[PDB]
Design a protein around this ligand. Structure first.
Ligand SMILES: *[C@@H]1O[C@H](CO)[C@@H](O[C@@H]2O[C@H](CO)[C@@H](O[C@@H]3O[C@H](CO[C@H]4O[C@H](CO)[C@@H](O)[C@H](O[C@H]5O[C@H](CO)[C@@H](O)[C@H](O)[C@@H]5O[C@H]5O[C@H](CO)[C@@H](O)[C@H](O)[C@@H]5O)[C@@H]4O)[C@@H](O)[C@H](O[C@H]4O[C@H](CO)[C@@H](O)[C@H](O)[C@@H]4O[C@H]4O[C@H](CO)[C@@H](O)[C@H](O)[C@@H]4O)[C@@H]3O)[C@H](O)[C@H]2NC(C)=O)[C@H](O)[C@H]1NC(C)=O
Ligand SMILES: Cc1cc(OCc2ccc(=O)[nH]n2)c(C(C)C)cc1Cl
Ligand SMILES: [Ca+2]
Ligand code: NA
Ligand code: NA
Ligand SMILES: [Zn+2]
Length: 805
């Protein structure tokens, strides 16, 4: 119950929310149905519109007007935004030349440059170039400030998951807003775009920027604007707040526009109807900048222009229906559209079986426009599994398509021409970032980056300590003129052992065999050198990875590769090798097909054994350093060491063998050499973080050999490909992947074909940042380079997306 009988007199858009049942005059009062009786009258004036005209100049103040053109409006903080232009002969901000803001130029009493986040819904990255002719204010911010060609949103590429990621620095699986629609089974409660439940605080996890600021003594304006408040009034409210006394004035503000998303859904991303919404958003930017210029704040405030996601062409006819696949369609609940999430309709139905639903959805139609996954098998770069609100069964929908349960859902539940929600590497889902102000760089273009990184930067801009988040703090230092965050590298927790030769061959009883007893001071001294690390500088180019947790491991050196061998997991944590452009590929000799060799530096008790693989009828093995890329027949024997072996399902060995035999050489040819680090990953609780030994759910039958959930490779070369990977004087170039270690290739519908037709496609889908691999392994890479630490942090956040230009 709201006692709407109180008054908003002098309380309009008050910053502190008054507690029930007193009536409210803050911005959220509309949403709660709780505004005081006179909120519209006092707080939402529209009389005479939003612009001064010549005849209004120096008018007598009339408090009825939406905004003012009287001589007292500046000191009142409530002129129409074009007041100085119409009445005082001033220029619009957009008509003024760009001039570098070398230092903040702030009115007295300003303790720090304020930050204004101007957020636009559905603003696709390519609008910056394609609409630049009708967005002169935005184009000036872009060209004069710091801008990326695009910014990558989080998955799913929906509004609230992305806005809340902007606010928190967290993946949606961590902040809890995992869709615009959700069921939480612990709460037994449903979140929807419409209604009141969505405001309940239990949905919203982590710590958004306005709470971070407030806890640290920095005041914040409204982030969530009620839809019915017009944009001109939002701008006027921000400008009014900026005129408050020092002790009352917020330092951080947000504006939000529902456009161009609103029209994009109706007309498609490039519908001729789209030019007008773009002009209108630009005009709003112009109002804000003119207003800042009036307040003498246009060279003091940092402004961020940022979108939540893009927009793709999608129509009703491009819908796949689950009723064309499933017999049991009425026993499931589907969350539909540009992604699908499936759960049982009733928890009392014990005939419900995820495995038969996945199977009925897998490669059933030749041009099928969605792919089903158990959530733990989705690409790890989506970071979309570790939350009870994410259903176990997920459908990844191809761009331009929808999925629905039944046809009647699409006409009785074509209207639309645009939608979004798809895989966040898809080009049409990319959105915008521009930063303009004293703290941002001048006329500077930065490479694309992910929106999870912005919270840290916003905290840097405000002098706040960020709450723990998923950005990599320092990775965006190159956007900033000042206020950079200068991190130190994490400390190594576990130092390696460097074992020498300590075991005789007969101490081992591993059930392995090798045809290797085939017999020199010329060549024996040299091989001893190789086992002590004499080639290490060729194969370990950026220092050894640091192990950031407590464990027992050995560094093992070889002619062609170096490894960090875990005595706990019985296999390498990492294996590092360099392949020059000139390297040659060779086969595994006939006599060495089943060759596995005890490693005399590592005890029998800390070694794998061949018998376990013999007896595990489902599991085979592969090697981390590939025998195919051996530098010489003699060095090839090193590749068959038991310490270079890892468990691999036959189906996965198809993928891995093609990568090692074909693709590594292809990359070395194209990139002028590559350095490769490969290894296993164990993430059985799908939290994106390295499993401890007691979280392992599967072992090679009868043994203590843990089965990886994934295998990674980090492939580094010189950004200037005129220099070979091993003699690179400057910046680096990286691509990485995290391949799921699965016992079938059901994910690849074309897997009956030659690996050349499907393997690299799979690997592209499972592209990864080096940072993703760090989280999953407890390793820290690139510890010894000639590059700045912030540059290396940006490299570790790089994702190679394989999308066209
Ligand atoms: C992205 O960045 C984020 C942020 O840094 C990373 O997330 C952190 O990861 C940590 C490890 O997973 C995690 O640490 C745990 O904290 C527990 C305390 O939990 C509360 O307090 C924090 C701090 O305020 C709060 O943020 C939490 O909020 C979560 O939960 C609520 C709802 O319950 C949500 O509103 C919110 O969105 C968030 O949910 C997310 O995280 C939780 C896990 O916390 C998931 O369950 C959700 O799916 C969702 O993703 C909490 O309110 C603490 O209890 C844990 O301690 C256990 O484990 C440690 C191991 O060190 C052990 O010492 C303890 O014994 C303890 O075990 C006991 O409980 C076990 C489980 O019941 C039991 O099995 C044992 O037998 C023991 O009795 C743990 O330390 C931290 O909370 C989150 N922070 C956030 C914000 O998510 C994330 O990892 C990064 N991602 C990547 C890929 O890098
Ligand atoms: C910049 C920004 C805006 C924002 O909400 C704006 C909004 C969205 C829908 C709406 O109806 N009204 N307003 C959020 C939300 C509160 C999570 C976070 C951030 Cl970071
Ligand atoms: Ca884990
Ligand atoms: Na086997
Ligand atoms: Na297949
Ligand atoms: Zn939308």
């Amino acid at each position: 119950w709201t006692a709407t009988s109180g008054s908003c007199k002098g309380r309009c858009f008050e910053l502190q929310e008054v507690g029930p049942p007193d009536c409210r005059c803050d911005n959220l009062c509309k949403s709660y149905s709780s505004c005081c009786h006179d909120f519209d009258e006092l707080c939402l004036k529209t009389a005479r519109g939003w612009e001064c005209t010549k005849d209004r100049c120096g008018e007598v103040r009339n408090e009825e007007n939406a905004c003012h053109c009287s001589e007292d409006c500046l000191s009142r903080g409530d002129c129409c935004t074009n007041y100085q232009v119409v009445c005082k002969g001033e220029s619009h901000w957009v008509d003024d030349d760009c001039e570098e803001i070398k230092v903040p130029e702030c009115p007295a009493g300003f303790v720090r440059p304020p930050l204004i986040i101007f957020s636009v819904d559905g603003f696709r990255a390519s609008y910056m170039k394609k609409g630049s002719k009708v967005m002169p204010n935005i184009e000036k911010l872009r060209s004069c400030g710091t801008h990326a060609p695009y910014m990558r949103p989080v998955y799913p590429t929906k509004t609230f998951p992305n806005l809340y990621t902007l606010a928190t620095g967290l993946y949606p699986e961590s902040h809890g807003i995992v869709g615009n629609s959700m069921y939480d089974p612990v709460f037994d409660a449903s979140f929807h775009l419409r209604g009141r439940e969505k405001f309940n605080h239990r949905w919203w996890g982590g710590q958004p920027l306005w709470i971070t600021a407030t806890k640290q003594g920095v005041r914040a304006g409204t982030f969530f604007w009620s839809v019915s408040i017009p944009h001109e009034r939002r701008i006027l409210t921000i400008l009014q707040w900026l005129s408050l006394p020092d002790n009352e004035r917020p330092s951080v503000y947000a504006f939000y526009s529902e456009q161009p998303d609103f029209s994009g859904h109706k007309y498609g991303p490039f519908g001729p109807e789209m030019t007008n919404p773009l002009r209108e958003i630009d005009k709003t930017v112009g109002q804000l900048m003119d207003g800042l210029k009036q307040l003498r704040l246009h060279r003091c405030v940092n402004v961020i222009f940022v979108g939540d996601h893009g927009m793709e062409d999608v129509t009703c006819d491009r819908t796949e229906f689950l009723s064309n696949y499933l017999t049991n369609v009425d026993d499931i609940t589907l969350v539909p559209g540009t992604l699908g999430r499936i759960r049982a309709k009733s928890i009392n139905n014990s005939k419900y079986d995820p495995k038969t639903i996945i199977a009925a959805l897998t490669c059933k139609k030749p041009d099928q426009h969605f792919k089903p996954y158990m959530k733990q098998h989705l690409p790890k770069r989506l970071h979309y599994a570790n939350n009870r609100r994410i259903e176990d069964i997920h459908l990844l929908v191809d761009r331009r398509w929808h999925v629905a349960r039944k046809p009647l859902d699409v006409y009785k539940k074509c209207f639309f021409q645009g939608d979004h929600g798809f895989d966040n590497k898809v080009n049409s889902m990319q959105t915008v970032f521009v930063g303009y102000g004293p703290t941002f760089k001048y006329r500077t273009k930065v490479p694309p980056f992910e929106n999870i990184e912005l919270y840290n930067v916003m905290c840097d801009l405000l002098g706040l300590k960020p709450a723990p988040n998923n950005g990599t703090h320092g990775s965006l230092n190159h956007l900033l003129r000042t206020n950079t965050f200068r991190p130190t590298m994490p400390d190594e927790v576990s130092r390696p052992n460097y074992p020498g030769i300590m075991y005789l061959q007969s101490e081992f009883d591993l059930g392995c065999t090798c045809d290797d007893k085939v017999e020199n001071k010329l060549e024996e001294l040299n091989k001893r050198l190789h086992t002590k690390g004499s080639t290490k500088e060729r194969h370990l180019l950026y220092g050894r990875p640091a192990v950031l947790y407590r464990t027992s491991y050995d560094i093992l050196y070889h002619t062609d590769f170096e490894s960090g061998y875990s005595e706990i997991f019985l296999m390498p944590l990492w294996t590092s090798y360099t392949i020059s452009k000139q390297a040659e590929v060779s086969s595994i000799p006939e006599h060495l097909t089943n060759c596995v060799r005890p490693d005399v530096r590592v005890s029998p008790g800390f070694s794998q054994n061949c018998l376990a693989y013999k007896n595990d009828k489902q599991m085979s093995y592969g090697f981390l350093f590939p025998p195919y890329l051996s530098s010489s027949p003699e060095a090839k024997y090193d590749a068959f060491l038991v310490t270079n072996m890892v468990p691999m399902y036959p189906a996965f060995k198809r993928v891995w063998a093609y990568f090692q035999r074909v693709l590594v050489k292809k990359y070395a040819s194209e990139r002028n050499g590559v350095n490769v680090i490969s290894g296993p990953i164990f993430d059985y609780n799908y939290d994106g973080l390295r499993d401890t030994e007691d979280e392992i759910k599967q072992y090679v039958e009868g043994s203590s050999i843990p089965v990886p959930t994934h295998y990674y490779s980090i492939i580094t070369s010189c950004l200037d490909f005129t220099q070979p990977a091993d003699k690179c004087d400057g910046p680096l170039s990286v691509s990485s992947f995290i391949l799921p270690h699965r016992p079938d290739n059901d994910e690849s519908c074309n897997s009956s074909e030659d690996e050349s037709k499907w393997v690299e496609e799979l690997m592209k889908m499972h592209t990864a940042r080096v940072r993703d691999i760090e989280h999953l392994t407890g390793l820290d890479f690139y510890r010894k380079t000639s590059r700045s630490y912030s540059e290396i942090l940006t490299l570790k956040t790089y994702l190679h997306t394989y999308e066209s230009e």
